[PDB]
Amino acid sequence: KIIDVDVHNEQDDRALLPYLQEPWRSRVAASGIGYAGSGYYSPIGVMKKDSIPPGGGKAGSDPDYMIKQLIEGYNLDYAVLTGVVYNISSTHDPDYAAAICSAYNDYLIAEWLGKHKAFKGALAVATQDPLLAAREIDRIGGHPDIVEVMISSAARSPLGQRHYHPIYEAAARNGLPVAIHPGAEGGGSSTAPTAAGYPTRYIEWHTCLSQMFMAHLVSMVCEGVFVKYPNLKVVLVEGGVAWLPGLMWRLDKNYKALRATVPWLTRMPSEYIRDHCYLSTQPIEEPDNPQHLIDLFNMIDAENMLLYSSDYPHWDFDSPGHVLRGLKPEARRKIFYENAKQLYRLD
Amino acid sequence: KIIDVDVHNEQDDRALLPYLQEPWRSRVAASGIGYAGSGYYSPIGVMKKDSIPPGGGKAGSDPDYMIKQLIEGYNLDYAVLTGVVYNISSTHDPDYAAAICSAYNDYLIAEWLGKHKAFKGALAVATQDPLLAAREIDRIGGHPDIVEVMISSAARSPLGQRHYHPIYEAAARNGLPVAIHPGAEGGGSSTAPTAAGYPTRYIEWHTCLSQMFMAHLVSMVCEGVFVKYPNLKVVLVEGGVAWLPGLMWRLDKNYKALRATVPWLTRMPSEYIRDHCYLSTQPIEEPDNPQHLIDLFNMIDAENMLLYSSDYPHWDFDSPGHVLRGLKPEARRKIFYENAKQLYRLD
Ligand SMILES: [Fe+3]
Ligand SMILES: [Fe+3]
Ligand SMILES: [Fe+3]
Ligand SMILES: [Fe+3]
Ligand code: NA
């Protein structure tokens, strides 16, 4: 039926205290997790309506409330819990960041993935010190309910550059796709959140996040990341879709004239993207004619690259029934179930 | 029959010396114009085949050769000379950058615009000091063959922010569209050239230029530049087309949820763009099925915002007969002549 590839479980900073190494544990006990936020005030908060659990705190913080509202509410075969901790990549201390990710991966294993069969996990790593991220991927990637690695797209340079390759080597060797998720662009020591620098308000910052993915993606393709690690899968989570055709054409046209500068590439850039990359659908783009979005998919044979997600319980939550309704049934099968069942090797 | 809204006349740095005050003249005579280039080496170079004039200098440097090879080799009724000096916005000294722009505008008027009727020009200004740019727009904007202002997309912050508004105010007051053109991104004291920072190779830098336009465009709309200045037209020159619809759909969707934060907006973001912005066609996007580009246009009704340009004499130059052969005649007339004729009020 349905696999949701982006479900944000949440937790009080103090939920990680039992899993944190010293000195980082004492830090969090005294001040919470030193997240270095983007600094763009959204007024509609982040969460949707009536997702705050009974008695609980943050929306998404109660496994039982989420089994009910999401797993059985919308009949989901599997849900990939992606948490929020990958955002710590924006902070300044590489060891603090890795230690927080390490404690979260354990917490997720101990307290979430065993509470339902549908529950699967993205392991989080910090990108400031890619060597520590490789360690964590090898430490914990073997767990049978851990199906991918989650990275923030708030980095210190384009993600295709060699400083990061230890992460791709480790994930590809383990068979774990690398998911990339926005949220922290511009915070702490990451790069400016848009090519033109820092916008003034949240609506600009949010709209522009897709452009970070385009930059990172051009870097990963042209730096030959997929030539160097032919087993790598990259999943672009929550960054839009409709921009991909134009990027594909622009990048292919430049490649035709510029191939000699990038000789490790032996097929067109668009084919590397199609063969190695996936994109989640949330927040689904809404042309006035919904048929248009589908026409866009078909223009670049992207039905095998698209993964449904709800992004429960955020304000732009996508219920599966209302998304992509004019899709052929065989394409709807692929985007709602089969692409992800294959990608994560589920069942 | 045809109007070409982006043609790069070139000149020897030394050609500005008669228009330059000291100490600027002495610097140019000794060291050329201090362009802070992208620092990305193009192996082809920025120039076309067989465009180097007889015995003359750079391709595009000779009015009579250009009149022959371009203005009449293709049956252009008007060509908008845009030069390359607007790239000087990347440099560190605002007074130097303004003087350079002022000397170029004087040179363009005296040595180019009168040498043929099809010649129309784009006054250039430096963005480091928008007050000096406003003064230059008022000095020169009234000339009968000056049809627009030209600024570089390599800025120190998103171009919709209030720091730049004196430019838009002066252009609108003189009935001049404001054109934006890539080329200097990341040079000197401008912002990093992509949202992810600095890529390693020309092919990435060039591909990602569209994203700079996307960020500036979202800035101008959301900062209410088209509400503050309701008689302002903006021309996105040489930055692609196929990304527009996904941007229009993402922005409109966020607008619906976030309109309270941006109350000066009393219409959908997509509609400010449709009513205030144009985009040149070069470099024409080349999908496998050239129909897919046109299908893309009609999804957003963009036939009224697209302006043909050849971008002579660059490597990704576009010959008129070759681009958009699939267009309906009425759409072709608009894109190749009618949009530009109305915009610049020619004839
Ligand atoms: Fe998400
Ligand atoms: Fe979200
Ligand atoms: Fe140009
Ligand atoms: Fe060019
Ligand atoms: Na920063």
Residue numbers in the entry:
A (entry chain B), B (entry chain A): 5 to 351
The publication says:
The genomic neighborhoods of candidate AROs stemming from Litorilinea aerophila (A0A540VG95, referred to as SfbO), Afipia carboxidovorans (B6JH23), Cytobacillus firmus (W7L2Y2), and Geobacillus strain Y412MC10 (D3EI84) intimate disparate physiological functions. Each of these proteins was fused to an N-terminal His6 tag, recombinantly expressed in Escherichia coli, and purified as soluble protein preparations. For initial studies, the expression medium was supplemented with additional FeII sources to ensure the formation of an intact dinuclear active site. Aerobic samples of these Fe2-metalated proteins were found to exhibit moderately intense UV/vis features centered near ∼350 nm, consistent with charge transfer bands classically associated with diferric FeIII–OHx–FeIII motifs. These features were diminished upon anaerobic addition of ∼1.2 equiv of sodium dithionite (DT) and returned following reexposure of these samples to air.
Dinuclear monooxygenases mediate challenging C–H bond oxidation reactions throughout nature. The protein components of AibH1H2 stem from a largely uncharacterized structural superfamily, PF04909, containing over 100,000 unique proteins that can individually function as either carboxylases, hydratases, hydrolases, or monooxygenases. Representatives of the latter enzyme class—collectively defined here as “amidohydrolase-related dinuclear oxygenases” (AROs)—include PtmU313 and AibH2,9,15 which employ dinuclear cofactors with different metal identities. Herein we utilize this “guilt by association” strategy to identify four candidate AROs that can each harbor redox-active dinuclear active sites. Each of the four candidate AROs can harbor redox-active diiron cofactors.
